[PDB]
């Protein structure tokens, strides 16, 4: 399965999705800079509308514990 095919379900907790992401990211062998680009970009983009909304409110500069606690009720 390709990294672009990794997406969050409509009922799937973000948490279970983030695990899937760094597992597939774990099978990507690209430069770190590209993998940083993938992190800030693709993760949020394939996140579900309800959490996506939430993550837009965190702004930039956000870290994984704060994202992970931010989308917990969703």
């Amino acid at each position: 399965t390709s990294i672009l095919d990794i997406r969050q379900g409509p009922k799937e907790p973000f948490r279970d999705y983030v695990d899937r992401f760094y597992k597939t990211l774990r099978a990507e062998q690209a430069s770190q800079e590209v993998k940083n680009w993938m992190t800030e970009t693709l993760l949020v983009q394939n996140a579900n509308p309800d959490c996506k909304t939430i993550l837009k409110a965190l702004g930039p500069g956000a870290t994984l514990e704060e994202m992970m606690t931010a989308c917990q009720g969703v």
Binding site: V18, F21, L64, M68
Partner: protein, 147 residues
């Protein structure tokens, strides 16, 4: 790891498969539970950075946590470099180079280099510096993964 031989010198010996497997099994069974940290600490006795990346790289599963840890290891490493600046002028022929955050993380150093630093007199405890970063990052995880 670097262990003491019968002759009375410190030499490197490889870590054992049922030690490896015991590390695996702990993680399988107790995931993020606190008992993992003393357990880790015992199984990391006399261990190298190289052996510590081996242990972290051999994990399966919990990839969100594994990424959070990585990023903590690099932050703690960035902080090592910040706090300890490089030293004045060229490196002496008679001496060996001071480590950076990435040598502590095992990344920029070789094994023989990791054995030079630890076995040499004074010795420098690059294991114990990485160990605190691992334990610190383990606290971060434990605190997050509390429900």
């Amino acid at each position: 790891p670097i262990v003491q031989n019968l002759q009375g010198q410190m030499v490197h010996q490889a870590i054992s498969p049922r030690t490896l497997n015991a590390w695996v099994k702990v993680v399988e069974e107790k995931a993020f539970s606190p008992e993992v940290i003393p357990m880790f600490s015992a199984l990391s006795e006399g261990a190298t950075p190289q052996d510590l990346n081996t242990m972290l790289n051999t994990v399966g599963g919990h990839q969100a946590a594994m990424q959070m840890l990585k990023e903590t290891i690099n932050e703690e490493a960035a902080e090592w470099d910040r706090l300890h600046p490089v030293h004045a002028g060229p490196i002496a022929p008679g001496q060996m180079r001071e480590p950076r955050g990435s040598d502590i993380a095992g990344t920029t150093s070789t094994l023989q280099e990791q054995i030079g630093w630890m076995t040499h007199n004074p010795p420098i405890p690059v294991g114990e510096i990485y160990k605190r970063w691992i334990i610190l990052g383990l606290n971060k995880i434990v605190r997050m993964y509390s429900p």
